[PDB]
Amino acid sequence: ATFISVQLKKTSEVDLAKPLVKFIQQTYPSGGEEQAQYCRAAEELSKLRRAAVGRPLDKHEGALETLLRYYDQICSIEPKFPFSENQICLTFTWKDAFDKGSLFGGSVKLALASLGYEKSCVLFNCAALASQIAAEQNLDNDEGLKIAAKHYQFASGAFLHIKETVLSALSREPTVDISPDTVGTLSLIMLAQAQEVFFLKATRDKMKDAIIAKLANQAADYFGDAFKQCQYKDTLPKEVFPVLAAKHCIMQANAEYHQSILAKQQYYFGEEIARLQHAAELIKTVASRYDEYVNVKDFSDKINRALAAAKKDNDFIYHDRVPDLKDLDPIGKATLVKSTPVNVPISQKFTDLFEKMVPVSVQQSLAAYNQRKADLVNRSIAQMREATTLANGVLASLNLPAAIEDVSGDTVPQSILTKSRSVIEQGGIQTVDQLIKELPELLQRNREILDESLRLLDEEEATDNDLRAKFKERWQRTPSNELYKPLRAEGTNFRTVLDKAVQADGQVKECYQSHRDTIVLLCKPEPELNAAIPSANPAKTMQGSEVVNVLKSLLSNLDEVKKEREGLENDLKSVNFDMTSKFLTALAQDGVINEEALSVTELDRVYGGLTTKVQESLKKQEGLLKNIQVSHQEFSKMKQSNNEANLREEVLKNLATAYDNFVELVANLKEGTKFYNELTEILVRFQNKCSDIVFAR
């Protein structure tokens, strides 16, 4: 008995672990569980590749499951780690299986940086090992038949899934062994051999000759088509070709011998003889020409015994005419066999070591959701602040609401009194003065950290350069200059950040000293404050003036509008939607993730109720300011201009402006502080990254 199998492809060993670990750590928070279990996984993955591929040796189902295990695992990894985005220099190198190319060689290799290459090759080896296990089977035996029939149909299916898979993965020309045409021929050889096994099972089980003829004819159909595919392309080892031809003939002769036993049974005697004669011719021919590859004697003895016995009976008794082959009905065909679809998992007891890991597709949708959400929220905050700033400025330049609460010109208007006490409560000028004083100190701290860090790199570099000059032979590591350039680039980066911060300190210093004194007044206790604001005569027709009640009410609703901006801002900030689960769904039920359309509709459900109100705020402000200014323009006409109330008038406008400035400055000075504090965080880490690289070197 002789069946075709395929030899395994050889690979060079490659470290799977360390290029994958580089990513894992750059993805998740260092020193955590979501980074612990994945490094334990990527190293066991590297080991598994070694057991699956590292040696072409073992030859039974123990080593096959390990190969299948590896196939399934590699297919499970793909949607995680970013392979569909070329930048990992994990490059796989395989040899052609058959020592075959489209050039005059002895061997040919292909190194490729692709998982699609890795998985075609593993699959091919899965297929090939399966073919070898099948060929080894004892076909006298019911477990043998069965294991052979299942392995050939596996190989055929694996070979065929490679055929439909190679090109779109392998963005190159594949080695001959894994190219569509070869792999389509291998698939058909494996299917033909499965049919062969089923023909043997039916024979062993003493099934009807009509069934056996049809299973054998079908096997011949498969073998003939594979033979034909080989006739004008030599891509398989040298033995494949004549074995296909012999097996094609043997399966025809079998078809004919069984159909002959059918003709006899039906008393078609000349037909028995013509079919036996054909069987004999085919087998005579197989024995002379393919003697090296098959043994066919028993079958030939059996044909001859049948032929002689049938010719004795015909010549003496029946006198039936022997027809020509061309006038005989075709024997039918019956396939019992199929190419096994490839569907991960193909191994028994499979578990994805990286199942818990989130697909890359989701990150580049979860991080992208963030940049759209952030755009929307900041945008909204900024619009509102910029609006409130503009309203307060307009109000101040019109002495509102002070003017309308200014009964005489003798006391502190209630609103200025409210703002004053509000400034005093927040600590008065002491709080601004203290924050101004420490801003140069939080700057200096950060400069010290950046500078101490770069000094380190410099020190180490100097001694490294001096050791290379003196101990040329004893001292050859890559220079410090080169190891350090990545860190030195973060260095000059941080420098740029610190400069923009200094410029920002400028704006805040200039503002603070330009507004200090008026603020100091606003913070004085109420009787003292009153004495410093000039008195004036009331323009007494401010009883229940209608131009006043309108201004009062317009200003009240403008107030309403700006207090409402605070809750809007806080709710804009306090809410969030975790979007992972949505993306999980969109990916598991559909092909890919369409984040653009999916996030926009979610941002609209979560933030729409708020972005609506924010836009309604601006328009409402625009309405209010327009007719506040046409209403004031009338109000000023009624109450005249002398210098006693002009002076009081400026002092009041300037006191309202002082309040806006205390408020703007406290906030700028806190933004400054937080910035300079969070920058010490980032820079302490940087100091450690520098001391670590100088301690290892």
């Binding site: 950040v497 700028n668 933004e671 400054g672 910035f675 980032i682």
Partner: peptide
């Protein structure tokens, strides 16, 4: 923007 909270956050 006053202080470079943009540069700081992406770091």
């Amino acid at each position: 923007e006053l202080y470079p909270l943009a540069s700081l956050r992406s770091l």
